[PDB]
Amino acid sequence: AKVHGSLARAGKVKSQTPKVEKTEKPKKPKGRAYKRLLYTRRFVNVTLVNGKRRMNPGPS
Amino acid sequence: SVGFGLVYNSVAEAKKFEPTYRLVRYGLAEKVEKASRQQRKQKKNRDKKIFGTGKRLAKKVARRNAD
Amino acid sequence: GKGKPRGLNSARKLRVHRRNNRWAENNYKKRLLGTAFKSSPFGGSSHAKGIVLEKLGIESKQPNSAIRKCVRVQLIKNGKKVTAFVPNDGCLNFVDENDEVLLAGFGRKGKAKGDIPGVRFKVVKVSGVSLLALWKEKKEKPRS
Amino acid sequence: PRAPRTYSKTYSTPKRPYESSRLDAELKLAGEFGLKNKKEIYRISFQLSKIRRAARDLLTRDEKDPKRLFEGNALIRRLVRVGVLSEDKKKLDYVLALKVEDFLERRLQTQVYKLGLAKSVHHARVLITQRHIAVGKQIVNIPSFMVRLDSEKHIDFAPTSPFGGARPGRVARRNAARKAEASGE
RNA sequence: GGAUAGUGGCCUACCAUGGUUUCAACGGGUAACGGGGAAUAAGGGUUCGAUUCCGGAGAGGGAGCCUGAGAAACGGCUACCACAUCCAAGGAAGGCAGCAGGCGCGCAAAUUACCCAAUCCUAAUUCAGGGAGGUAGUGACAAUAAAUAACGAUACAGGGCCCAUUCGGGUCUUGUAAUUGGAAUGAGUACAAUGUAAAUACCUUAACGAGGAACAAUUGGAGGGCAAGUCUGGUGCCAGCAGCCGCGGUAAUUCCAGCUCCAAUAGCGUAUAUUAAAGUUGUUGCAGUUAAAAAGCUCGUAGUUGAACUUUGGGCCCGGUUGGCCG
RNA sequence: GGACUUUUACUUUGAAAAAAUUAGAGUGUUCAAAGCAGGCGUAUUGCUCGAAUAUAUUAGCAUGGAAUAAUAGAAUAGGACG
Ligand SMILES: [Mg+2]
Ligand SMILES: [Mg+2]
Ligand SMILES: [Mg+2]
Ligand SMILES: [Mg+2]
Ligand SMILES: [Mg+2]
Ligand SMILES: [Mg+2]
Ligand SMILES: [Mg+2]
Ligand SMILES: [Mg+2]
Ligand SMILES: [Mg+2]
Ligand SMILES: [Mg+2]
Ligand SMILES: [Mg+2]
Ligand SMILES: [Mg+2]
Ligand SMILES: [Mg+2]
Ligand SMILES: [Mg+2]
Ligand SMILES: [Mg+2]
Ligand SMILES: [Mg+2]
Ligand SMILES: [Mg+2]
Ligand SMILES: [Mg+2]
Ligand SMILES: [Mg+2]
Ligand SMILES: [Mg+2]
Ligand SMILES: [Mg+2]
Ligand SMILES: [Mg+2]
Ligand SMILES: [Mg+2]
Ligand SMILES: [Mg+2]
Ligand SMILES: [Mg+2]
Ligand SMILES: [Mg+2]
Ligand SMILES: [Mg+2]
Ligand SMILES: [Mg+2]
Ligand SMILES: [Mg+2]
Ligand SMILES: [Mg+2]
Ligand SMILES: [Mg+2]
Ligand SMILES: [Mg+2]
Ligand SMILES: [Mg+2]
Ligand SMILES: [Mg+2]
Ligand SMILES: [Mg+2]
Ligand SMILES: [Mg+2]
Ligand SMILES: [Mg+2]
């Protein structure tokens, strides 16, 4: 195959995606408290059983 | 606090059977300080190049100033 | 019994046959011929640092259709020339021929990776500053 | 030229990395007994697997064998002494059948909670580590301690460290430095 | 016979023609010091050991030798070869695979620091000396323990549940809450004592030291294998992804981001190797009609293998170790 | 002490046997990796448990066994006992 194809576009999309800066957000509990936060979220007060248990449903 | 102790039959008995750094910690021996370890070694090695007393070599090196 | 001598004193025949048939084992063959030392641009090592000659637009294989950004590298310990990939969109702006990159295996036991034809190596660092770091923003490329 | 300081690792790691059923049952243990790692569960399963292994290797021998009796009773008596093995099922065909929660049950994490004193598995965590409750006068800050079935009667708050009564402490005594400084002179 | 401390083709003289080998001699290779051991966990195996102990070999490469109980010594000498230094040009001097440190080489590895206090060693010796060794520095090699929060109050709301003719919220807490509440502790800092040869840290412990601006956890992934979105924006077979299968050519469940989510977590990715998965090296344990594989055929030496039969059967005695019904 | 003995393989037990490593006992390094400690008293002039056990496989040595599998013997009798 060809080897000397163009290089002008090196970085095209990364350099033209609009930068939407991150958003400041509540600090997450780093440690056992997170495993606890997973426990009560997953098993204690379970949110929905709409057929099955969705773990990241946006527009359901 | 769990430690270890010695009690000697006399104070003379201690100042000979005791480590010389413990008598420093107490006061029963003045810390006679000397030049650094790697200074004494260099002194020894410098000393090893002179066969004899040496001050006889100071006379012949006084002849150097003439020539 | 189909072949293998079941006799109680046939150990030599059984050892030697194994010895002989190990050679059909692809890995056993390379390990004893020292192929990594003989062949294989890297001297048998995990990485190898080299120097960039020219920047190549290797065109991907089918059914893909792209231009995969790569650099021809002349390994220091070897002088062997090797064309290696520069991953991660961008990153061909970091290399700048005559530079000193650190190559690494591509993770297919030789065997060029994907649609990239005949590229068995990828860049990990340039100018000693960690391609990944340059990509994000963590480090900056050195003076020259 | 020194005798090599020996070491060993205290945990194993599961082969299937994303077995969802296994992950479920793990979080439950971490959430019940207040752990922070899967390694805190991996460790116990590692310790438990070797214990079974000795038991397995011993059963294959003939009953009342010298090694089997000597080392078998030791294993039984040790597990009993820390309170993991029941008094009746005390002949090592049950130590083969031991499960993870039995070991988790003896951690100073849990006895400190089971016997009041924390009202929460996680309050137990923070109390233990923070120079609070002891065994004798011997303070202990390791949530995994294996309360040994007879040191169970000695899990009280520390002689230091309020909640056992020695002093308020810097955070509380600071308020006593603003109640007597703003109100008085 | 000579030589050695001594055996011996160790060497010499004389004589003889022997010595090894398909049960692989001889030769080649080794990215080869051997071993205790290391990694991988059904077993059988596979792979590795330069390197904490033991043995051997070496001191830039060869050879030679002095001293001596012991060296073919190298921090001893002599010579040559290769290095390489100083000079007044006449000459003289060096051997870090000791401890540090430097250059080179590379993917790849730390201080030109302190002490003989310990462990031991040497001497004429209780003392001196010891870069042996110990101390500290550098140090995410590997290994252990396991902080980044814990508990109330209250504001709607929900599920319990007694009643339900019908207002509902009442006291059992499930917790999501954009106001609150006093509690706790070392990370750090630091009198002091402790530690230490002297210091440093650790273990102790005055005075300080937590509310989101923090004392603010990361590293990968979120189509399948594979745990976690068919969300919004961007690009438009480009840029890039993608171990493997495959994504991207204008509504992208794979790219570039935001959001949210998963996994492991003071750790996590990648590369290379190796082991398991591999009964894809198969002794245990493979396959060979057609998928890879029975020599065209027969003889046949080495090798492996090889029918059945030769004191069986009956009798007496001694004393052991479990287990029973009993104590 | 004298006089002689067909050869072997296998299996049993045992001696000979470094430590660290491994497996493993005892012991609450605050836990644990470790370590080989330590535990008791009259804690004002000592009492005292330890520092196990196992594997150590080919060869060599020692011993019990005599199935399995080899070897040798008396045929031109140049046989066997006395
Ligand atoms: Mg000196
Ligand atoms: Mg072939
Ligand atoms: Mg080219
Ligand atoms: Mg001769
Ligand atoms: Mg001849
Ligand atoms: Mg052969
Ligand atoms: Mg070599
Ligand atoms: Mg080797
Ligand atoms: Mg294999
Ligand atoms: Mg070795
Ligand atoms: Mg080497
Ligand atoms: Mg030598
Ligand atoms: Mg050298
Ligand atoms: Mg020499
Ligand atoms: Mg030297
Ligand atoms: Mg020497
Ligand atoms: Mg050096
Ligand atoms: Mg390194
Ligand atoms: Mg030193
Ligand atoms: Mg932090
Ligand atoms: Mg804060
Ligand atoms: Mg992230
Ligand atoms: Mg995404
Ligand atoms: Mg899934
Ligand atoms: Mg394809
Ligand atoms: Mg659009
Ligand atoms: Mg769109
Ligand atoms: Mg989209
Ligand atoms: Mg991992
Ligand atoms: Mg078999
Ligand atoms: Mg097959
Ligand atoms: Mg065909
Ligand atoms: Mg065929
Ligand atoms: Mg045929
Ligand atoms: Mg033929
Ligand atoms: Mg037969
Ligand atoms: Mg034996």
Side-chain angles (χ1 to χ4, degrees), chain C residues 49-75:
Chain C
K49 197 202 280 184
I51 283 196
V52 186
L53 299 189
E54 62 176 345
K55 306 159 90 164
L56 301 183
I58 316 299
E59 62 170 4
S60 60
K61 263 140 90 178
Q62 292 306 303
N64 280 14
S65 166
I67 298 186
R68 321 243 81 114
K69 309 306 175 301
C70 300
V71 283
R72 274 233 114 187
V73 187
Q74 214 228 346
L75 296 171

PDB file of all heavy atoms in Angstrom, chain C residues 49-75:
ATOM      1  N   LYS C  49      14.782   2.195  22.611  1.00  0.00           N
ATOM      2  CA  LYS C  49      14.812   3.607  22.268  1.00  0.00           C
ATOM      3  C   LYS C  49      15.506   3.798  20.930  1.00  0.00           C
ATOM      4  O   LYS C  49      16.520   3.153  20.650  1.00  0.00           O
ATOM      5  CB  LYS C  49      15.534   4.408  23.353  1.00  0.00           C
ATOM      6  CG  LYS C  49      15.268   5.896  23.288  1.00  0.00           C
ATOM      7  CD  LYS C  49      16.353   6.701  23.981  1.00  0.00           C
ATOM      8  CE  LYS C  49      16.178   6.716  25.492  1.00  0.00           C
ATOM      9  NZ  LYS C  49      17.206   7.598  26.132  1.00  0.00           N
ATOM     10  N   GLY C  50      14.960   4.690  20.107  1.00  0.00           N
ATOM     11  CA  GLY C  50      15.519   4.937  18.791  1.00  0.00           C
ATOM     12  C   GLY C  50      15.437   6.383  18.350  1.00  0.00           C
ATOM     13  O   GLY C  50      15.256   7.276  19.181  1.00  0.00           O
ATOM     14  N   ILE C  51      15.565   6.639  17.050  1.00  0.00           N
ATOM     15  CA  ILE C  51      15.608   8.001  16.539  1.00  0.00           C
ATOM     16  C   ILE C  51      14.758   8.103  15.281  1.00  0.00           C
ATOM     17  O   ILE C  51      14.791   7.224  14.414  1.00  0.00           O
ATOM     18  CB  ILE C  51      17.061   8.452  16.296  1.00  0.00           C
ATOM     19  CG1 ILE C  51      17.699   8.802  17.637  1.00  0.00           C
ATOM     20  CG2 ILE C  51      17.123   9.634  15.349  1.00  0.00           C
ATOM     21  CD1 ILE C  51      18.954   9.604  17.535  1.00  0.00           C
ATOM     22  N   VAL C  52      13.992   9.188  15.193  1.00  0.00           N
ATOM     23  CA  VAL C  52      13.004   9.373  14.138  1.00  0.00           C
ATOM     24  C   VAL C  52      13.699   9.779  12.849  1.00  0.00           C
ATOM     25  O   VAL C  52      14.451  10.760  12.817  1.00  0.00           O
ATOM     26  CB  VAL C  52      11.970  10.427  14.553  1.00  0.00           C
ATOM     27  CG1 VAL C  52      10.853  10.510  13.524  1.00  0.00           C
ATOM     28  CG2 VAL C  52      11.425  10.108  15.923  1.00  0.00           C
ATOM     29  N   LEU C  53      13.433   9.040  11.774  1.00  0.00           N
ATOM     30  CA  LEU C  53      13.937   9.441  10.467  1.00  0.00           C
ATOM     31  C   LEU C  53      12.903  10.273   9.712  1.00  0.00           C
ATOM     32  O   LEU C  53      13.146  11.445   9.406  1.00  0.00           O
ATOM     33  CB  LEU C  53      14.347   8.210   9.651  1.00  0.00           C
ATOM     34  CG  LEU C  53      15.464   7.315  10.200  1.00  0.00           C
ATOM     35  CD1 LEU C  53      15.892   6.266   9.171  1.00  0.00           C
ATOM     36  CD2 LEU C  53      16.646   8.148  10.655  1.00  0.00           C
ATOM     37  N   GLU C  54      11.737   9.695   9.430  1.00  0.00           N
ATOM     38  CA  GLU C  54      10.716  10.411   8.680  1.00  0.00           C
ATOM     39  C   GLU C  54       9.344  10.007   9.188  1.00  0.00           C
ATOM     40  O   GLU C  54       9.166   8.926   9.752  1.00  0.00           O
ATOM     41  CB  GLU C  54      10.829  10.150   7.176  1.00  0.00           C
ATOM     42  CG  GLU C  54      10.632   8.711   6.748  1.00  0.00           C
ATOM     43  CD  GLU C  54      10.654   8.560   5.227  1.00  0.00           C
ATOM     44  OE1 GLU C  54      10.543   9.595   4.526  1.00  0.00           O
ATOM     45  OE2 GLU C  54      10.785   7.412   4.729  1.00  0.00           O
ATOM     46  N   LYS C  55       8.375  10.900   8.983  1.00  0.00           N
ATOM     47  CA  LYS C  55       7.001  10.714   9.444  1.00  0.00           C
ATOM     48  C   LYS C  55       6.158  10.203   8.279  1.00  0.00           C
ATOM     49  O   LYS C  55       6.088  10.855   7.234  1.00  0.00           O
ATOM     50  CB  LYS C  55       6.437  12.025  10.000  1.00  0.00           C
ATOM     51  CG  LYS C  55       7.308  12.641  11.091  1.00  0.00           C
ATOM     52  CD  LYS C  55       7.069  14.127  11.288  1.00  0.00           C
ATOM     53  CE  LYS C  55       5.992  14.384  12.321  1.00  0.00           C
ATOM     54  NZ  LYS C  55       5.986  15.796  12.814  1.00  0.00           N
ATOM     55  N   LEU C  56       5.529   9.043   8.454  1.00  0.00           N
ATOM     56  CA  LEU C  56       4.872   8.330   7.365  1.00  0.00           C
ATOM     57  C   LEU C  56       3.365   8.316   7.556  1.00  0.00           C
ATOM     58  O   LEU C  56       2.874   8.153   8.676  1.00  0.00           O
ATOM     59  CB  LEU C  56       5.367   6.887   7.270  1.00  0.00           C
ATOM     60  CG  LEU C  56       6.867   6.716   7.044  1.00  0.00           C
ATOM     61  CD1 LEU C  56       7.229   5.241   6.882  1.00  0.00           C
ATOM     62  CD2 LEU C  56       7.311   7.528   5.838  1.00  0.00           C
ATOM     63  N   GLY C  57       2.633   8.465   6.456  1.00  0.00           N
ATOM     64  CA  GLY C  57       1.195   8.311   6.499  1.00  0.00           C
ATOM     65  C   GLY C  57       0.756   6.939   6.033  1.00  0.00           C
ATOM     66  O   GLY C  57       0.232   6.810   4.925  1.00  0.00           O
ATOM     67  N   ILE C  58       0.990   5.907   6.849  1.00  0.00           N
ATOM     68  CA  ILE C  58       0.641   4.538   6.468  1.00  0.00           C
ATOM     69  C   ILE C  58      -0.865   4.439   6.291  1.00  0.00           C
ATOM     70  O   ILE C  58      -1.631   4.733   7.216  1.00  0.00           O
ATOM     71  CB  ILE C  58       1.131   3.538   7.520  1.00  0.00           C
ATOM     72  CG1 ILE C  58       2.556   3.857   7.965  1.00  0.00           C
ATOM     73  CG2 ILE C  58       1.047   2.129   6.985  1.00  0.00           C
ATOM     74  CD1 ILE C  58       3.567   3.791   6.859  1.00  0.00           C
ATOM     75  N   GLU C  59      -1.305   4.022   5.109  1.00  0.00           N
ATOM     76  CA  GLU C  59      -2.733   3.929   4.855  1.00  0.00           C
ATOM     77  C   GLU C  59      -3.254   2.587   5.353  1.00  0.00           C
ATOM     78  O   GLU C  59      -2.698   1.530   5.032  1.00  0.00           O
ATOM     79  CB  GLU C  59      -3.065   4.146   3.376  1.00  0.00           C
ATOM     80  CG  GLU C  59      -2.488   3.148   2.395  1.00  0.00           C
ATOM     81  CD  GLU C  59      -3.075   3.321   0.990  1.00  0.00           C
ATOM     82  OE1 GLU C  59      -3.871   4.273   0.796  1.00  0.00           O
ATOM     83  OE2 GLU C  59      -2.747   2.504   0.089  1.00  0.00           O
ATOM     84  N   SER C  60      -4.314   2.650   6.159  1.00  0.00           N
ATOM     85  CA  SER C  60      -4.894   1.493   6.821  1.00  0.00           C
ATOM     86  C   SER C  60      -5.292   0.420   5.814  1.00  0.00           C
ATOM     87  O   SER C  60      -5.479   0.680   4.621  1.00  0.00           O
ATOM     88  CB  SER C  60      -6.121   1.914   7.628  1.00  0.00           C
ATOM     89  OG  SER C  60      -7.110   2.493   6.785  1.00  0.00           O
ATOM     90  N   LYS C  61      -5.425  -0.804   6.318  1.00  0.00           N
ATOM     91  CA  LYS C  61      -5.877  -1.916   5.504  1.00  0.00           C
ATOM     92  C   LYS C  61      -7.390  -1.857   5.328  1.00  0.00           C
ATOM     93  O   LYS C  61      -8.093  -1.071   5.966  1.00  0.00           O
ATOM     94  CB  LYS C  61      -5.459  -3.251   6.131  1.00  0.00           C
ATOM     95  CG  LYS C  61      -4.174  -3.850   5.562  1.00  0.00           C
ATOM     96  CD  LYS C  61      -3.297  -4.471   6.642  1.00  0.00           C
ATOM     97  CE  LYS C  61      -3.629  -5.928   6.875  1.00  0.00           C
ATOM     98  NZ  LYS C  61      -2.738  -6.519   7.898  1.00  0.00           N
ATOM     99  N   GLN C  62      -7.889  -2.698   4.447  1.00  0.00           N
ATOM    100  CA  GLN C  62      -9.320  -2.849   4.286  1.00  0.00           C
ATOM    101  C   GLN C  62      -9.892  -3.699   5.421  1.00  0.00           C
ATOM    102  O   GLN C  62      -9.158  -4.434   6.086  1.00  0.00           O
ATOM    103  CB  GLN C  62      -9.607  -3.467   2.923  1.00  0.00           C
ATOM    104  CG  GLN C  62      -9.267  -2.523   1.792  1.00  0.00           C
ATOM    105  CD  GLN C  62      -9.966  -1.179   1.950  1.00  0.00           C
ATOM    106  OE1 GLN C  62     -11.192  -1.118   2.033  1.00  0.00           O
ATOM    107  NE2 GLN C  62      -9.188  -0.097   2.006  1.00  0.00           N
ATOM    108  N   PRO C  63     -11.207  -3.595   5.691  1.00  0.00           N
ATOM    109  CA  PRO C  63     -12.143  -2.665   5.052  1.00  0.00           C
ATOM    110  C   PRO C  63     -12.103  -1.273   5.677  1.00  0.00           C
ATOM    111  O   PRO C  63     -13.027  -0.489   5.492  1.00  0.00           O
ATOM    112  CB  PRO C  63     -13.502  -3.336   5.266  1.00  0.00           C
ATOM    113  CG  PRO C  63     -13.328  -4.125   6.505  1.00  0.00           C
ATOM    114  CD  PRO C  63     -11.900  -4.569   6.553  1.00  0.00           C
ATOM    115  N   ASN C  64     -11.038  -0.967   6.408  1.00  0.00           N
ATOM    116  CA  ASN C  64     -10.906   0.375   6.942  1.00  0.00           C
ATOM    117  C   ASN C  64     -10.328   1.305   5.881  1.00  0.00           C
ATOM    118  O   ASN C  64      -9.802   0.873   4.852  1.00  0.00           O
ATOM    119  CB  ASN C  64     -10.038   0.376   8.197  1.00  0.00           C
ATOM    120  CG  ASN C  64     -10.800  -0.065   9.434  1.00  0.00           C
ATOM    121  OD1 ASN C  64     -11.896  -0.622   9.346  1.00  0.00           O
ATOM    122  ND2 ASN C  64     -10.218   0.185  10.598  1.00  0.00           N
ATOM    123  N   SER C  65     -10.441   2.607   6.138  1.00  0.00           N
ATOM    124  CA  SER C  65     -10.020   3.620   5.168  1.00  0.00           C
ATOM    125  C   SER C  65      -9.522   4.829   5.961  1.00  0.00           C
ATOM    126  O   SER C  65     -10.308   5.698   6.341  1.00  0.00           O
ATOM    127  CB  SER C  65     -11.163   3.988   4.231  1.00  0.00           C
ATOM    128  OG  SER C  65     -10.892   5.173   3.506  1.00  0.00           O
ATOM    129  N   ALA C  66      -8.215   4.878   6.194  1.00  0.00           N
ATOM    130  CA  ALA C  66      -7.643   5.941   7.009  1.00  0.00           C
ATOM    131  C   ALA C  66      -6.159   6.071   6.692  1.00  0.00           C
ATOM    132  O   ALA C  66      -5.605   5.333   5.876  1.00  0.00           O
ATOM    133  CB  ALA C  66      -7.873   5.673   8.499  1.00  0.00           C
ATOM    134  N   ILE C  67      -5.520   7.033   7.351  1.00  0.00           N
ATOM    135  CA  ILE C  67      -4.089   7.268   7.243  1.00  0.00           C
ATOM    136  C   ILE C  67      -3.537   7.224   8.658  1.00  0.00           C
ATOM    137  O   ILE C  67      -3.739   8.169   9.431  1.00  0.00           O
ATOM    138  CB  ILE C  67      -3.774   8.607   6.569  1.00  0.00           C
ATOM    139  CG1 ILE C  67      -4.317   8.612   5.137  1.00  0.00           C
ATOM    140  CG2 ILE C  67      -2.282   8.866   6.594  1.00  0.00           C
ATOM    141  CD1 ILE C  67      -3.934   9.831   4.328  1.00  0.00           C
ATOM    142  N   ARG C  68      -2.852   6.129   9.002  1.00  0.00           N
ATOM    143  CA  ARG C  68      -2.374   5.885  10.361  1.00  0.00           C
ATOM    144  C   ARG C  68      -0.991   6.503  10.536  1.00  0.00           C
ATOM    145  O   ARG C  68      -0.059   6.168   9.802  1.00  0.00           O
ATOM    146  CB  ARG C  68      -2.340   4.384  10.648  1.00  0.00           C
ATOM    147  CG  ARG C  68      -3.520   3.607  10.064  1.00  0.00           C
ATOM    148  CD  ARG C  68      -4.383   2.957  11.155  1.00  0.00           C
ATOM    149  NE  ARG C  68      -5.322   3.899  11.763  1.00  0.00           N
ATOM    150  CZ  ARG C  68      -6.646   3.832  11.653  1.00  0.00           C
ATOM    151  NH1 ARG C  68      -7.214   2.850  10.972  1.00  0.00           N
ATOM    152  NH2 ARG C  68      -7.405   4.749  12.233  1.00  0.00           N
ATOM    153  N   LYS C  69      -0.854   7.393  11.510  1.00  0.00           N
ATOM    154  CA  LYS C  69       0.350   8.200  11.624  1.00  0.00           C
ATOM    155  C   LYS C  69       1.453   7.409  12.307  1.00  0.00           C
ATOM    156  O   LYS C  69       1.263   6.897  13.413  1.00  0.00           O
ATOM    157  CB  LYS C  69       0.051   9.480  12.397  1.00  0.00           C
ATOM    158  CG  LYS C  69      -1.147  10.259  11.869  1.00  0.00           C
ATOM    159  CD  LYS C  69      -1.004  10.561  10.391  1.00  0.00           C
ATOM    160  CE  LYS C  69      -2.248  11.221   9.841  1.00  0.00           C
ATOM    161  NZ  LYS C  69      -3.438  10.355  10.029  1.00  0.00           N
ATOM    162  N   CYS C  70       2.614   7.330  11.650  1.00  0.00           N
ATOM    163  CA  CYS C  70       3.713   6.461  12.062  1.00  0.00           C
ATOM    164  C   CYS C  70       5.049   7.162  11.849  1.00  0.00           C
ATOM    165  O   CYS C  70       5.142   8.166  11.142  1.00  0.00           O
ATOM    166  CB  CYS C  70       3.686   5.136  11.289  1.00  0.00           C
ATOM    167  SG  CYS C  70       2.170   4.191  11.528  1.00  0.00           S
ATOM    168  N   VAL C  71       6.102   6.609  12.453  1.00  0.00           N
ATOM    169  CA  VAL C  71       7.444   7.180  12.358  1.00  0.00           C
ATOM    170  C   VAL C  71       8.469   6.072  12.121  1.00  0.00           C
ATOM    171  O   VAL C  71       8.463   5.051  12.818  1.00  0.00           O
ATOM    172  CB  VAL C  71       7.804   7.981  13.623  1.00  0.00           C
ATOM    173  CG1 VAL C  71       7.111   9.328  13.607  1.00  0.00           C
ATOM    174  CG2 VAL C  71       7.415   7.199  14.859  1.00  0.00           C
ATOM    175  N   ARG C  72       9.362   6.278  11.149  1.00  0.00           N
ATOM    176  CA  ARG C  72      10.463   5.349  10.920  1.00  0.00           C
ATOM    177  C   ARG C  72      11.594   5.644  11.897  1.00  0.00           C
ATOM    178  O   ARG C  72      12.131   6.759  11.924  1.00  0.00           O
ATOM    179  CB  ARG C  72      10.966   5.436   9.483  1.00  0.00           C
ATOM    180  CG  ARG C  72      10.202   4.560   8.513  1.00  0.00           C
ATOM    181  CD  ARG C  72      11.131   3.652   7.723  1.00  0.00           C
ATOM    182  NE  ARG C  72      10.901   2.245   8.050  1.00  0.00           N
ATOM    183  CZ  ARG C  72      11.661   1.242   7.619  1.00  0.00           C
ATOM    184  NH1 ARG C  72      12.709   1.498   6.843  1.00  0.00           N
ATOM    185  NH2 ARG C  72      11.379  -0.012   7.966  1.00  0.00           N
ATOM    186  N   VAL C  73      11.967   4.633  12.679  1.00  0.00           N
ATOM    187  CA  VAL C  73      12.870   4.777  13.814  1.00  0.00           C
ATOM    188  C   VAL C  73      14.105   3.915  13.588  1.00  0.00           C
ATOM    189  O   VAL C  73      14.000   2.761  13.157  1.00  0.00           O
ATOM    190  CB  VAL C  73      12.160   4.380  15.124  1.00  0.00           C
ATOM    191  CG1 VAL C  73      13.031   4.690  16.312  1.00  0.00           C
ATOM    192  CG2 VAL C  73      10.817   5.080  15.233  1.00  0.00           C
ATOM    193  N   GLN C  74      15.275   4.471  13.885  1.00  0.00           N
ATOM    194  CA  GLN C  74      16.544   3.761  13.748  1.00  0.00           C
ATOM    195  C   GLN C  74      17.052   3.487  15.159  1.00  0.00           C
ATOM    196  O   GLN C  74      17.588   4.381  15.820  1.00  0.00           O
ATOM    197  CB  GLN C  74      17.544   4.568  12.929  1.00  0.00           C
ATOM    198  CG  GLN C  74      18.459   3.721  12.080  1.00  0.00           C
ATOM    199  CD  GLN C  74      19.908   4.115  12.226  1.00  0.00           C
ATOM    200  OE1 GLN C  74      20.223   5.176  12.766  1.00  0.00           O
ATOM    201  NE2 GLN C  74      20.803   3.257  11.757  1.00  0.00           N
ATOM    202  N   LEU C  75      16.880   2.244  15.609  1.00  0.00           N
ATOM    203  CA  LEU C  75      17.132   1.905  17.004  1.00  0.00           C
ATOM    204  C   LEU C  75      18.596   2.126  17.357  1.00  0.00           C
ATOM    205  O   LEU C  75      19.499   1.844  16.566  1.00  0.00           O
ATOM    206  CB  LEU C  75      16.725   0.456  17.284  1.00  0.00           C
ATOM    207  CG  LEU C  75      15.233   0.132  17.119  1.00  0.00           C
ATOM    208  CD1 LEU C  75      14.966  -1.364  17.210  1.00  0.00           C
ATOM    209  CD2 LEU C  75      14.399   0.888  18.138  1.00  0.00           C
TER     210      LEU C  75
END
